[PDB]
Coordinates of C-alpha atoms (C1' of nucleotides) and ligand atoms in Angstrom, one line a residue:
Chain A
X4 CA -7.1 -15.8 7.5
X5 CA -5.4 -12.7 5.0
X6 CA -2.0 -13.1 5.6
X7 CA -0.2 -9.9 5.8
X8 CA 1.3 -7.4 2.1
X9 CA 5.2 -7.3 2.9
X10 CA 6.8 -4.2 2.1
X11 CA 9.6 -5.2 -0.5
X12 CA 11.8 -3.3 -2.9
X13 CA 10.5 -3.7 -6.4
X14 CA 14.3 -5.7 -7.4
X15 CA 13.6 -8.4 -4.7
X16 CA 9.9 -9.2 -6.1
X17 CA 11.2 -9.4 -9.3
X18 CA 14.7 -11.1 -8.5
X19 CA 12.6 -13.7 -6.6
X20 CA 11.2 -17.3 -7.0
X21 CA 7.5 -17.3 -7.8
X22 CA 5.2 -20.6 -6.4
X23 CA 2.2 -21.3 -8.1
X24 CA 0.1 -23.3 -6.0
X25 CA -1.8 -26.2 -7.5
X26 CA -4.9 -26.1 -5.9
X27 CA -7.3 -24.1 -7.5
X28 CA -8.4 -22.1 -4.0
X29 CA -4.1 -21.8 -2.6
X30 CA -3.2 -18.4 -2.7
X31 CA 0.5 -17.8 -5.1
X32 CA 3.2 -16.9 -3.1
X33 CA 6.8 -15.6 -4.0
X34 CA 10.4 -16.4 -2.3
X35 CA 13.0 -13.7 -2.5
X36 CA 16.6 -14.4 -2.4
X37 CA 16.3 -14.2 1.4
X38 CA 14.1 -17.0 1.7
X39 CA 11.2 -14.2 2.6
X40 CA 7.7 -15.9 2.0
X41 CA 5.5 -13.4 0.2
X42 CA 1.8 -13.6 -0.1
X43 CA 1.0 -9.7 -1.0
X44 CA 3.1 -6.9 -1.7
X45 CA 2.9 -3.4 -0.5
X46 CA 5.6 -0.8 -2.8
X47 CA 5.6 2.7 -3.3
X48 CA 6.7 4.4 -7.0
X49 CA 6.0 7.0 -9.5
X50 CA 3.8 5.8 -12.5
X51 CA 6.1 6.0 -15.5
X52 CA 3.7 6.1 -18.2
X53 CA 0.1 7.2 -18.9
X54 CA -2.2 4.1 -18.1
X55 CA -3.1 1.1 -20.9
X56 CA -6.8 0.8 -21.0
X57 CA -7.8 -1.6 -23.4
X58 CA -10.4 -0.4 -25.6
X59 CA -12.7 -3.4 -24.8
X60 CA -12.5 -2.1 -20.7
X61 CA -11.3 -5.6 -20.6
X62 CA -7.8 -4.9 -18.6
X63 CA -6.1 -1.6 -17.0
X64 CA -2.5 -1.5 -16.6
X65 CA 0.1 1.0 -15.1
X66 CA 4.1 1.6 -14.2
X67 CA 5.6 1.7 -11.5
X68 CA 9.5 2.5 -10.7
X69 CA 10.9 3.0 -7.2
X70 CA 14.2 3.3 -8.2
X71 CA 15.4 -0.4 -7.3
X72 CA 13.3 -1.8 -10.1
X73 CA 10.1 -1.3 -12.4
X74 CA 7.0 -3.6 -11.9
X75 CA 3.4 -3.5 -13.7
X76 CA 0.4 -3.1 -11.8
X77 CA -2.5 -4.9 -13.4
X78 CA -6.6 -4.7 -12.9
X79 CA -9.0 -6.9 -14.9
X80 CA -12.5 -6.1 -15.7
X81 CA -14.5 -3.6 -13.8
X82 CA -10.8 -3.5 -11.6
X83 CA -10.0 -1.6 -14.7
X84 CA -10.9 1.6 -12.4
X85 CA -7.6 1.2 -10.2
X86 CA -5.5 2.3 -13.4
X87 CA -7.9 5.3 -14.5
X88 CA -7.4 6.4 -10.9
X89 CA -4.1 6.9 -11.5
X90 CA -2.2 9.5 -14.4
X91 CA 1.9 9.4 -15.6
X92 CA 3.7 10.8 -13.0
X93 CA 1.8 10.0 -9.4
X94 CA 3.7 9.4 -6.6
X95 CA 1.9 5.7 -5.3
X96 CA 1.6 3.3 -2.8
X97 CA 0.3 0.3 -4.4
X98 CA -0.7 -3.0 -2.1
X99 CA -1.9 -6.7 -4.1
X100 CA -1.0 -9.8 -4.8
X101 CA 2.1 -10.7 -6.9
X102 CA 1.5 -12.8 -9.9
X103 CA 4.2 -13.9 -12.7
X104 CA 3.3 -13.7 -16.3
X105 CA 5.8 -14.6 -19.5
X106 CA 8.3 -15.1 -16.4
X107 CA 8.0 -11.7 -15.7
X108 CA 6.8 -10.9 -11.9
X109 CA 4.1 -8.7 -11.4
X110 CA 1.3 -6.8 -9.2
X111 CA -2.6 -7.4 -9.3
X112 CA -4.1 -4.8 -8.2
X113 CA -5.8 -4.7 -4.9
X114 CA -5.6 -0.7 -4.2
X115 CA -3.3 2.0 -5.2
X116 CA -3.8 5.9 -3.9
X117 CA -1.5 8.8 -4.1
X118 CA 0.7 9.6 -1.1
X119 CA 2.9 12.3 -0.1
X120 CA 6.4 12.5 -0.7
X121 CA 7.2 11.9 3.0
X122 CA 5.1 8.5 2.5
X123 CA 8.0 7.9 0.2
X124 CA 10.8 8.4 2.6
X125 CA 8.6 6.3 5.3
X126 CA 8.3 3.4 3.0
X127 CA 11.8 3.4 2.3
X128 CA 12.9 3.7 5.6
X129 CA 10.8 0.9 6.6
X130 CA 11.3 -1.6 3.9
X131 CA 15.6 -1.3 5.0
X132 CA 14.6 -1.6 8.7
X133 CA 12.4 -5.0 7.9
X134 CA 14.9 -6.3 5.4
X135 CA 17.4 -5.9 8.2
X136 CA 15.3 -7.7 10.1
X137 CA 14.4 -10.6 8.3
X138 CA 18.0 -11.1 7.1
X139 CA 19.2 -11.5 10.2
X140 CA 16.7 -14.0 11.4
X141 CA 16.9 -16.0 8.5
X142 CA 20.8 -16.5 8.7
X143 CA 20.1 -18.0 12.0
X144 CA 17.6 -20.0 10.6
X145 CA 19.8 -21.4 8.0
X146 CA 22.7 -22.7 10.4
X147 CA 19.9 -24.6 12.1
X148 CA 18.7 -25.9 8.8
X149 CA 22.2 -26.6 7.9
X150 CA 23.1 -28.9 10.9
X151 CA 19.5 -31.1 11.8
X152 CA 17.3 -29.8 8.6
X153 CA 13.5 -30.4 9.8
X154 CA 13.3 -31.8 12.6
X155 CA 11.0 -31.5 15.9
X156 CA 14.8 -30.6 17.8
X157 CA 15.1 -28.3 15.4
X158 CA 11.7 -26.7 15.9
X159 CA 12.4 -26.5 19.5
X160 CA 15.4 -24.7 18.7
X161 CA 14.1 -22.6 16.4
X162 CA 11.7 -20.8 19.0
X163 CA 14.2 -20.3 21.7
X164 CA 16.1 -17.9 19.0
X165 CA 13.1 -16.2 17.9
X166 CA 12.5 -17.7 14.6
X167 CA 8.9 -19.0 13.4
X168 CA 8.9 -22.3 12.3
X169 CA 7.6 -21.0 8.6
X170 CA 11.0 -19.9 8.0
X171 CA 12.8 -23.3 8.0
X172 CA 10.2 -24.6 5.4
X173 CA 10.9 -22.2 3.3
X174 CA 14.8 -22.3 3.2
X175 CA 14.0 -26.0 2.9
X176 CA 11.6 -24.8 -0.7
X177 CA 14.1 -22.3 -2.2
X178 CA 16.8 -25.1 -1.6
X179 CA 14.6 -27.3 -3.6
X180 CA 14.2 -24.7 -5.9
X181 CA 17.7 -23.7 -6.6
Chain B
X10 CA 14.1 -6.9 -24.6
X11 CA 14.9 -3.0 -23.7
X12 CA 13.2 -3.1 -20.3
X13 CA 12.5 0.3 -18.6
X14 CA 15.8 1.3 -16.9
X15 CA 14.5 2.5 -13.4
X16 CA 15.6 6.1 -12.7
X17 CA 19.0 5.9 -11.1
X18 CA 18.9 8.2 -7.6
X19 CA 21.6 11.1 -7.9
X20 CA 22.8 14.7 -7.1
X21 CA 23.4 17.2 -9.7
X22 CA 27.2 16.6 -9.3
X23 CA 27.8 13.5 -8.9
X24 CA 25.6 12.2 -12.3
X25 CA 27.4 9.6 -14.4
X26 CA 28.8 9.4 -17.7
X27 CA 27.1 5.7 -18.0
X28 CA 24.0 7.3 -16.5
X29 CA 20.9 7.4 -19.0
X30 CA 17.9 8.0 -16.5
X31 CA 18.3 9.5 -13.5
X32 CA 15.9 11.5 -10.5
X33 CA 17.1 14.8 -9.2
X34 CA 15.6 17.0 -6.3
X35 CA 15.6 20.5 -6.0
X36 CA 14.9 24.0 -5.6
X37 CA 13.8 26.2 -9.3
X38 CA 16.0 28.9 -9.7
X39 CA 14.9 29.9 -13.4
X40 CA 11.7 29.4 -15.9
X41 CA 12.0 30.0 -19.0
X42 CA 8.4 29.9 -20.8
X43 CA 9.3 30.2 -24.1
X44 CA 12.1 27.5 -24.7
X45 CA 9.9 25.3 -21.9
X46 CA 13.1 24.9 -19.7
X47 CA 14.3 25.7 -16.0
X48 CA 16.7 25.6 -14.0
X49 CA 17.0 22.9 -11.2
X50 CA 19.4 23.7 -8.2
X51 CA 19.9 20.8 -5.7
X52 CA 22.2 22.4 -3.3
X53 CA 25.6 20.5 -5.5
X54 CA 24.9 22.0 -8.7
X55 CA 22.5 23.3 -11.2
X56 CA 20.8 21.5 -14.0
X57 CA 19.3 22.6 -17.2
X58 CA 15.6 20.8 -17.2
X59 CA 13.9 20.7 -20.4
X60 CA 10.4 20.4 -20.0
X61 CA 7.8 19.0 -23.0
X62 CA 4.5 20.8 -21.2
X63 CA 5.0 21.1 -17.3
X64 CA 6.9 24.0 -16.4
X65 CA 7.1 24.7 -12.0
X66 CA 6.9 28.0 -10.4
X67 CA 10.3 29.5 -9.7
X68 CA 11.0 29.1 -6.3
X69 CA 9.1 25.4 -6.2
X70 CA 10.9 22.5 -4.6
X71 CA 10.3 19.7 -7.3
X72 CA 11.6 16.3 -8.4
X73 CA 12.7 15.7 -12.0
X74 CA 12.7 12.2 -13.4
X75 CA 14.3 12.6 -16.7
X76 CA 17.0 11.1 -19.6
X77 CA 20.1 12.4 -19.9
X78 CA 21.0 14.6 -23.0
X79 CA 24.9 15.1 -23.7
X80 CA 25.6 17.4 -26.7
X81 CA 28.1 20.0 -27.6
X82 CA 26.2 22.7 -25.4
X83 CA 26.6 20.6 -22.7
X84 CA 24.4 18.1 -20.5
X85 CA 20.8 18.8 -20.2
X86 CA 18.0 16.5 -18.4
X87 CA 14.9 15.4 -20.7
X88 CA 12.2 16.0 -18.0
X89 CA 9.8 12.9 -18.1
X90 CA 8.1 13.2 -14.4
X91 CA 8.3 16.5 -12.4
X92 CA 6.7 16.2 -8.8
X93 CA 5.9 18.5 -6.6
X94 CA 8.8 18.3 -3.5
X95 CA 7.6 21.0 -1.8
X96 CA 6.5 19.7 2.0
X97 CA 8.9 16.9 1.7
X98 CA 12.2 16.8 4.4
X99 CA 14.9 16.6 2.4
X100 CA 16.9 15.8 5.3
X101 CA 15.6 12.5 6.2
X102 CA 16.0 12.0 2.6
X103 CA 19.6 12.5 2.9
X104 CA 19.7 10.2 5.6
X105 CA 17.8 7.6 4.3
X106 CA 20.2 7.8 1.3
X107 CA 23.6 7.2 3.5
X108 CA 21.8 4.3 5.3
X109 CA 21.1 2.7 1.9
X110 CA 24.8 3.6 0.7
X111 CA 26.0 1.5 3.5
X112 CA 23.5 -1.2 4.2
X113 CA 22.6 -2.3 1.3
X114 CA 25.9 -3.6 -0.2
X115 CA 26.5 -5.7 3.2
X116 CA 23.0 -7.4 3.3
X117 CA 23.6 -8.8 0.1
X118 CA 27.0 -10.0 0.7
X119 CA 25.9 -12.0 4.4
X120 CA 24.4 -14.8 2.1
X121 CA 26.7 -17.6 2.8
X122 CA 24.6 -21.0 1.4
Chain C
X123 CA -0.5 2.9 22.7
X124 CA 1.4 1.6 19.1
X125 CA 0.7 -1.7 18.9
X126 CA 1.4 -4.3 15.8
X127 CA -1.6 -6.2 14.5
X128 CA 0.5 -9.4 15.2
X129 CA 0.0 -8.3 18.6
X130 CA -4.0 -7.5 18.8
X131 CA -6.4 -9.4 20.9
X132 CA -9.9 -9.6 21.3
X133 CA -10.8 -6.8 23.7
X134 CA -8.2 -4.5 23.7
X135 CA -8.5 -1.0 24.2
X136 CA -7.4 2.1 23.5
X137 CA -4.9 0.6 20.8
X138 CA -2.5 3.1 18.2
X139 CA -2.3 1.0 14.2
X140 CA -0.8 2.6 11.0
X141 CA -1.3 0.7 8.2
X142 CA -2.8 0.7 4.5
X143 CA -6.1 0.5 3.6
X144 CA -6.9 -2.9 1.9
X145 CA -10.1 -3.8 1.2
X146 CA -13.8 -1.7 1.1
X147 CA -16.3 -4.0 2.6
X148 CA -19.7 -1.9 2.8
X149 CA -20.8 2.1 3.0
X150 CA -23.9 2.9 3.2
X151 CA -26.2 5.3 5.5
X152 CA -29.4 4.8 8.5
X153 CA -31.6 7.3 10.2
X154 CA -30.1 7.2 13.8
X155 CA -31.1 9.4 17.0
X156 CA -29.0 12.6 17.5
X157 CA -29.2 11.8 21.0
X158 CA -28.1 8.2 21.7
X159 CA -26.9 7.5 17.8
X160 CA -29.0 4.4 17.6
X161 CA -31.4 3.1 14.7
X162 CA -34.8 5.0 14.5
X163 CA -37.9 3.3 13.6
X164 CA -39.9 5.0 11.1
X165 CA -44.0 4.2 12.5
X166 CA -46.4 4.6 9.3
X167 CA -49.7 5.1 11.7
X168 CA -48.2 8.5 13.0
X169 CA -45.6 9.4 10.8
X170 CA -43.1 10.4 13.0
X171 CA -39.1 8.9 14.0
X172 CA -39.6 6.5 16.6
X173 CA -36.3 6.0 19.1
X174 CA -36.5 3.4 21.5
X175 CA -34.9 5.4 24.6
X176 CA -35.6 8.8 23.1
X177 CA -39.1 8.7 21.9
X178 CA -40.6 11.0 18.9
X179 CA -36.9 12.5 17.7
X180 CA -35.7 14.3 14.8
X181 CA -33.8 11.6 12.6
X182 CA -29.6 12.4 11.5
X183 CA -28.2 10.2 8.7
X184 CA -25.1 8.3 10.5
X185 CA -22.6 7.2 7.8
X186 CA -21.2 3.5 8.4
X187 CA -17.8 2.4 6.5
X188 CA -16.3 -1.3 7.0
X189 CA -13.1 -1.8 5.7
X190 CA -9.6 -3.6 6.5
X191 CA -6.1 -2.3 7.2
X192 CA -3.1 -3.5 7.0
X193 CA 0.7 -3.0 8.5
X194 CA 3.0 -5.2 7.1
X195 CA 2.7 -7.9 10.1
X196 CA -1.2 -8.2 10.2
X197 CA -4.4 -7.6 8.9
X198 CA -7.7 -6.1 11.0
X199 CA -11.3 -5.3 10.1
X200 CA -12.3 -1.7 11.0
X201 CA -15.4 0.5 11.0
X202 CA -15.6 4.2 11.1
X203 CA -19.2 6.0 12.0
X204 CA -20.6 9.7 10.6
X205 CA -18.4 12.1 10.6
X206 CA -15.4 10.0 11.0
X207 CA -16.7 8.0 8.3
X208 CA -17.6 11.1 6.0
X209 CA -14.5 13.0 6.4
X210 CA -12.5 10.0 4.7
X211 CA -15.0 8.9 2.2
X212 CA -15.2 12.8 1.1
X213 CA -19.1 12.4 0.3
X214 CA -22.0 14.1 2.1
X215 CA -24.0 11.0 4.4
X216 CA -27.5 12.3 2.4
X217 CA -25.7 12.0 -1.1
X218 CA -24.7 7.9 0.1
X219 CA -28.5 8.1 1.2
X220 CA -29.3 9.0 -2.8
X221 CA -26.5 6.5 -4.0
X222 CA -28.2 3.5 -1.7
X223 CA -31.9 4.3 -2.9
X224 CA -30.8 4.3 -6.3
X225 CA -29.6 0.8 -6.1
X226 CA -32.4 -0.7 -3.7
X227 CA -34.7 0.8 -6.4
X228 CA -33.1 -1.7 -9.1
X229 CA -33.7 -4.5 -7.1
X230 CA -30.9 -5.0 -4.6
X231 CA -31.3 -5.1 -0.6
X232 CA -29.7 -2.6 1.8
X233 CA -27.0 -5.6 2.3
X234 CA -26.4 -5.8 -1.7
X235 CA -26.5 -2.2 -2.3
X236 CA -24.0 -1.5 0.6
X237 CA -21.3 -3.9 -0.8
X238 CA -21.6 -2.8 -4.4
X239 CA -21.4 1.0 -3.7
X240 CA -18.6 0.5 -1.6
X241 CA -16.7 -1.4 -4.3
X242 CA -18.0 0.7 -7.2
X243 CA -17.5 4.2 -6.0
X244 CA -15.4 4.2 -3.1
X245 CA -12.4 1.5 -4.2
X246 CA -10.4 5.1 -4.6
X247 CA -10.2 5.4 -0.5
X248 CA -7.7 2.0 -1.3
X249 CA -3.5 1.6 -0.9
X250 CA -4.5 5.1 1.3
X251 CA -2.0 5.2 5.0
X252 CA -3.9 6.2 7.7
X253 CA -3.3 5.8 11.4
X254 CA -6.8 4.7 13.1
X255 CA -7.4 4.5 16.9
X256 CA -10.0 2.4 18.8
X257 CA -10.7 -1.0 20.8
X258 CA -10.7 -4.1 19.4
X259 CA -14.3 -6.3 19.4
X260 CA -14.6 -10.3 18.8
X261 CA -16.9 -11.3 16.0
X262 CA -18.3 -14.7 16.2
X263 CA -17.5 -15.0 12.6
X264 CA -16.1 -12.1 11.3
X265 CA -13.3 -12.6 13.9
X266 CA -11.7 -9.3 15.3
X267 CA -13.3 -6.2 14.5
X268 CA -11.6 -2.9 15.4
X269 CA -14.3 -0.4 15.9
X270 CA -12.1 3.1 15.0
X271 CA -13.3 6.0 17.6
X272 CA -10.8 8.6 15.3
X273 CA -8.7 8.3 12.4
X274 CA -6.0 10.8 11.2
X275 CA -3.5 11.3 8.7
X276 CA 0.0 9.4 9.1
X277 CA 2.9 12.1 10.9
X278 CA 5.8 11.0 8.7
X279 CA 8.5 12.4 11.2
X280 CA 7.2 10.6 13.8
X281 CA 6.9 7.2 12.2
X282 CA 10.5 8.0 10.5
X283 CA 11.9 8.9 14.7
X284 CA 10.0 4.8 15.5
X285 CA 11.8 3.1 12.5
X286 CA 15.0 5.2 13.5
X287 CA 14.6 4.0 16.9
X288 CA 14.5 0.3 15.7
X289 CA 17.4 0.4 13.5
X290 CA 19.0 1.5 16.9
X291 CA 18.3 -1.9 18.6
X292 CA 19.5 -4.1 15.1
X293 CA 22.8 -2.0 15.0
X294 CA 22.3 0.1 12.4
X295 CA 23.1 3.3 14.0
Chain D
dT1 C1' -22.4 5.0 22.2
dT2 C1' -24.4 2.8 17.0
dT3 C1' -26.4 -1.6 11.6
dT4 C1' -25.9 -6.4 10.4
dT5 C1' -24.3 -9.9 11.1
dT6 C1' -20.8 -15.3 7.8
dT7 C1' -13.6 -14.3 7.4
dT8 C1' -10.2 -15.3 3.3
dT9 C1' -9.2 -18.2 -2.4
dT10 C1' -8.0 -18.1 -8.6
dT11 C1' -7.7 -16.8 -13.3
dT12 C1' -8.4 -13.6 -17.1
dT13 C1' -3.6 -10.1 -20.6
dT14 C1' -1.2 -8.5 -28.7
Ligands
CA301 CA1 -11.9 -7.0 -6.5
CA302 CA1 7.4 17.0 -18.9
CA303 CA1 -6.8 -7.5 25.9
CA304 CA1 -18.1 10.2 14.8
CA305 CA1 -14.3 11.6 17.2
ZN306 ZN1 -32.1 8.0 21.1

DNA sequence: TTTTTTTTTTTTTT
């Protein structure tokens, strides 16, 4: 399965609690402040600054700012050809996995393109509308967590109100975290 | 660590004193070629854009990420990005902007651990 | 009709998805018959294009372009054909003809060469939004498979007026 | 209406 790229401000990837996963074939995930599980990311920026090739072709890198926060976008390898795609200035949409580095959260590349300025306004429109969303569903999670934790009457409870059983592990995580 | 300060959304009027990056959209009003600067009007005010290499057409909806300048002539934007605005709807901009004006704060403050 | 790829299953028809391309899995090109659009057999003894329900034809090179999309609350295979496929990949069907022979020349199969031109020389078409249109098919394997009839680029407004409409139904407005 | 058939995973950075 290729679970889905969330579409996140840049301040709630990097504001977020990164999960490295000790198996050497588990995907890393990240939990933001509002216990949202986060395989991929999906953001849309300007580049910032004219792209880092490393001389040896060995790693590309690029900036991106969306005006809630500024992120790098990273390509290793032949994936070096994501960040010669792109030139300072570009209006993106970039899509990959997020990946932490020196404690600093990041984005490895999976695709970026150019989009037009109404792509902008789209994204930003719809990362407010799913943020709503999820917010809403995870405070109602969190009352249930609160009063029988993980439990199979919780479970029950938790599908009657619309709420995927997912989301009280990982209130349960980022309690253990915190 | 002097981390990239992300460019703070405003309108030409309403641009802080404590502001030191900010992104401005508007209409060009002016070029001039020789001094490589023009003048941005958003609708709230006008803004003297000085430009390092990219100069727009007059008449071209753009966006202008730039520093801030304050100096005795007055308060001039450093252009670092200028994109081209020109098929974009401003107005669901504008509305996009009010619903994040008044959203946001309250999503933050309904965490209650 | 707009459906979310959390909502897709096998066999459904005539279904609306916006989403981002994610992934390039294979572009490459085959002789097909202008008529039916199926694969042509080249016969060596009388040097002519051989279609099975068509008979001696006049071969067209059909461009094939497997890749996924994605919309936030799923992920779907999809595959474009000719000029669908062209008109997104922005490359002329007999220059992927030349690209593919170059590479099956230096020793790779149609299945090798297919893979590595698509991740070599079309990774640009990726992070793109598109809205593509088609039914969805069940691979035994490959698992569902949305086979794209038309794709077009995103109407802002009108995605803006759906989000608008769902903000409605939270509260918002 | 079509060709051909094996999904997705990590880790690497002056
Ligand atoms: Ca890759
Ligand atoms: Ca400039
Ligand atoms: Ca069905
Ligand atoms: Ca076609
Ligand atoms: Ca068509
Ligand atoms: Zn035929």
């Amino acid at each position: 399965k290729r679970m889905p790229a969330t579409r996140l401000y840049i301040k709630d990837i990097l504001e977020g609690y990164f999960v490295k996963s000790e198996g050497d074939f588990e995907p890393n995930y990240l939990i933001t402040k509002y216990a949202r599980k986060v395989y991929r990311a999906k953001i849309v920026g300007t580049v910032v600054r004219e792209p880092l090739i490393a001389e040896d072709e060995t790693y590309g890198k690029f900036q991106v700012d969306d005006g809630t926060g500024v992120i790098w976008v990273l390509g290793f390898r032949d994936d070096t050809k994501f960040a010669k795609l792109v030139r300072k200035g570009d209006l993106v949409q970039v899509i990959g996995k997020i990946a932490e580095w020196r404690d600093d959260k990041q984005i490895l590349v999976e695709g970026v393109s150019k989009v037009h300025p109404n792509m902008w306004i789209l994204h930003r429109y719809e990362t407010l509308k799913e943020k709503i969303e999820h917010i809403k569903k995870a405070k109602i999670a969190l009352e249930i967590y609160n009063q029988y934790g993980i439990t199979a009457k919780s479970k029950v409870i938790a599908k009657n109100k619309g709420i995927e059983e997912e989301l009280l592990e990982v209130i349960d995580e980022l309690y253990g975290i915190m | 660590v002097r981390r990239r300060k992300p460019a703070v959304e405003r309108k030409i009027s309403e641009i802080r004193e404590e502001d030191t990056r900010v992104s401005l959209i508007g209409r060009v009003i002016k070029v001039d070629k020789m001094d490589y600067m023009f003048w941005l009007d958003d609708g709230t005010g006008v803004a003297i854009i000085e430009s390092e290499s990219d100069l727009p057409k007059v008449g071209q909806v753009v966006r202008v990420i730039g520093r801030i300048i304050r100096n005795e002539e007055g308060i001039h934007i450093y252009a670092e990005v200028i994109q081209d605005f020109s098929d974009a709807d401003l107005e669901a901009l504008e509305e996009i902007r009010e619903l994040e004006r008044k959203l946001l704060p309250r999503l933050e403050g309904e965490i209650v651990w | 009709t707009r459906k979310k790829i959390k909502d897709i299953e096998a066999g459904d028809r005539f279904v609306e998805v916006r989403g981002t391309i994610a992934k390039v899995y294979r572009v490459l090109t085959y002789d097909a018959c202008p008529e039916c659009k199926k694969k042509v057999d080249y016969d060596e003894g009388l040097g002519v294009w051989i279609c099975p329900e068509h008979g001696e034809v006049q071969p067209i090179k059909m461009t094939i372009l497997d890749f996924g999309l994605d919309d936030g609350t799923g992920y779907i295979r999809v595959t474009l054909f000719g000029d669908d496929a062209e008109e997104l990949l922005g490359v002329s069907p007999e220059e992927i003809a030349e690209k593919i022979k170059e590479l099956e020349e230096s020793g790779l199969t149609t299945k090798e060469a297919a893979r590595k031109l698509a991740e070599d020389e079309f990774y640009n078409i990726i992070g793109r939004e598109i809205v593509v249109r088609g039914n969805v098919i069940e691979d035994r394997f490959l698992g569902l498979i949305l086979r794209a009839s038309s794709w077009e680029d995103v109407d802002y407004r009108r995605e803006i007026e759906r989000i608008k409409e769902e903000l409605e139904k939270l509260g918002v407005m």
